[PDB]
Symmetry: D2
Subunit: 42 residues, 4 copies
């Protein structure tokens, strides 16, 4: 489904349960932008 070559994946340890949800949130945020980056500007 799109994305031909998969870029190198990485990982990061985040102490704290509530704090973890915060980092993951920013992760999906930027990922959302990159997702619409494949759609023409109009």
């Amino acid at each position: 489904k799109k994305k031909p070559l998969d870029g190198e994946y990485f990982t990061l340890q985040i102490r704290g349960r509530e704090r973890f949800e915060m980092f993951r949130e920013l992760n999906e945020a930027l990922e959302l932008k990159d997702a619409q980056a494949g759609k023409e500007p109009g």
Copy 2:
């Protein structure tokens, strides 16, 4: 060394090498604040 009970640890996958360094940076940032949180206010 301080920190008696260790809080639950977690992890997060971050695609992209350059992007990874960015997330890790914010991680050490907040961790730096919590580190000085154990020092009296003066």
Copy 3:
């Protein structure tokens, strides 16, 4: 255009030109998520 009552707006000073672009990026990131939050799940 949608968004009836405007929520209280705020501001934050960010020293550094390159650093500024970084913060603004995360700003548009979360804003992008909230933008698709008004669209039904399918």
Copy 4:
């Protein structure tokens, strides 16, 4: 007090009161790192 030439300052609008506190938090986080960057490594 240290910091001879002040770097160009900037600003960013953040909608949402609770959300604002979140951004400001990351701001002080990186600023805390830069603060210890002036102290020798030991």
